[PDB]
Write a protein that binds this ligand. Sequence first.
Ligand code: NA
Ligand code: NA
Ligand code: NA
Ligand code: NA
Length: 170
Amino acid sequence: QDAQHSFRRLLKAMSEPGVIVALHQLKRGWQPLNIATTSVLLTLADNDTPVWLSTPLNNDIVNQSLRFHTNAPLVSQPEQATFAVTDEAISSEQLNALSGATLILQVASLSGGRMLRLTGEERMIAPQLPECILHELTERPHPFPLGIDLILTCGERLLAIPRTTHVEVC
Ligand code: NA
Ligand code: NA
Ligand code: NA
Ligand code: NA
């Protein structure tokens, strides 16, 4: 798909938190970045938006792909990120460093986790998330607009949970 396609689908996901959309702006992701993360980065990042990749996703091939296709500054630490890309090993420390940034969290499934109710009319989803991310979403310790916007990606699919969404467990 073209870039405009990616932009519209990402808008839709952001507009309707928890709805899953598919983005496929190239045939393969810059592995281990999935196709949705890669497409989000092609869509939003450029020379003005530093990107920080956590250690598991930070390798020379990923860095080279991202530099060539986006020219975003690839920063060594989360405190300077406009876009953070991690997997579910993201630590509480790194999360707190991102308050805020947009966190593209790669997950190995968008289902099969603890049930969440999203409001802000409700939507139910159940992605698998690390406890630090669940805490952030359910407690919202940082006043608007200091916290992260979250984009969860898996394969070519994604859903968004903007910082303004209310999230509950139960
Ligand atoms: Na929106
Ligand atoms: Na790993
Ligand atoms: Na941004
Ligand atoms: Na989990």
